[PDB]
Amino acid sequence: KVAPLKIKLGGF
Amino acid sequence: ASASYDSEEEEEGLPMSYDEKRQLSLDINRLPGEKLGRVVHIIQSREPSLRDSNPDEIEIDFETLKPTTLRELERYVKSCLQKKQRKP
Secondary structure, three states, X not given: OOOOOEXXXXXX | OOOOOXXXXXXXXXXXXXXXXXXXXXXXXXXXXHHHHHHHHHHHHHOHHHHHXXXXXXXXXXXOOOHHHHHHHHHHHHHHOOOOXXXX
């Protein structure tokens, strides 16, 4: 379980 | 007859390396929410998928994003992270 290069701000 | 090995200056047209993209994510987290607001809009400009969600959440995918957007994110973050310390 690894996500690609992304980023969330705050929540998911 | 022979490729000249073009070295370009296409900001919005250059392929960004995974390393660059990695830094981008770091540089964005280096920005406070006040400044994050702009980078969010920069993405939304191309990404209507972010707009689809709540602007409270930033939606970035450094893979399917185009140089036009990616570099614009960079361009902004880097302008903010120039810092009076790095450049006195």
